[PDB]
Design a protein around this nucleic acid. Structure first.
Ligand code: MG
Ligand code: MG
Ligand code: MG
Ligand code: MG
Ligand code: NA
Length: 151
DNA sequence: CGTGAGTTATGGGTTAGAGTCG
């Protein structure tokens, strides 16, 4: 059906801050969480890879990688934590169930939203005292600020 | 450093137009 093809990395080493000034950080080895940080060196740094679709998608599709690693952000289902998936190289071709690696990246001003290609009404979301999850919206926080050049 | 008339559209350059590329 729909196929996604990797173009290139379009953003290196950025930080995601939610609307509450909380940065995404590593929770353990599997998950991410969010926390208010004084020192942004504890914040995860991300790379963003752009994909084209085989059809005229409305919003650009991206993959999110933890910078200087082989760990890619992967969606599960609603209210479940995103998973860090280890991969030898960035996937050149994505279709079928592997679209859980991909997100539509939309901006509303300075606000950035990442919706699962596998679940287009679910967002990367932070929730107090819990891991970064897929969520439909409030009370979860779904709008992020992108802090660039944070290597 | 990235193709080949496509999703040609774009937040963007990748957007022209078959020819560079090592
Ligand atoms: Mg998580
Ligand atoms: Mg494609
Ligand atoms: Mg997804
Ligand atoms: Mg989001
Ligand atoms: Na489009």
């Amino acid at each position: 059906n729909v196929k996604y093809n990797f173009m290139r990395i379009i953003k290196y080493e950025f930080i995601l801050n939610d609307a509450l000034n909380q940065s995404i950080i590593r929770a353990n080895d599997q998950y991410l969480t969010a926390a208010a940080l004084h020192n942004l060196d504890e914040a995860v740094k991300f790379d963003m890879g752009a994909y084209k679709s085989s059809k005229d998608d409305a919003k650009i599709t991206v993959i999110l990688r933890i910078s200087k690693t082989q760990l890619y952000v992967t969606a599960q289902d609603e209210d479940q934590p995103v998973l860090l998936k280890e991969m030898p190289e960035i996937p050149k071709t994505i279709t079928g169930s592997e679209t859980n690696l991909l997100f539509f990246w939309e901006t509303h001003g300075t606000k950035n939203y990442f919706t699962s290609v596998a679940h287009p009404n679910l967002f990367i979301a932070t929730k107090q005292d819990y891991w970064v999850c897929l969520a439909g919206g409030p009370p979860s926080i779904t709008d992020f600020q992108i802090l660039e050049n944070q290597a």
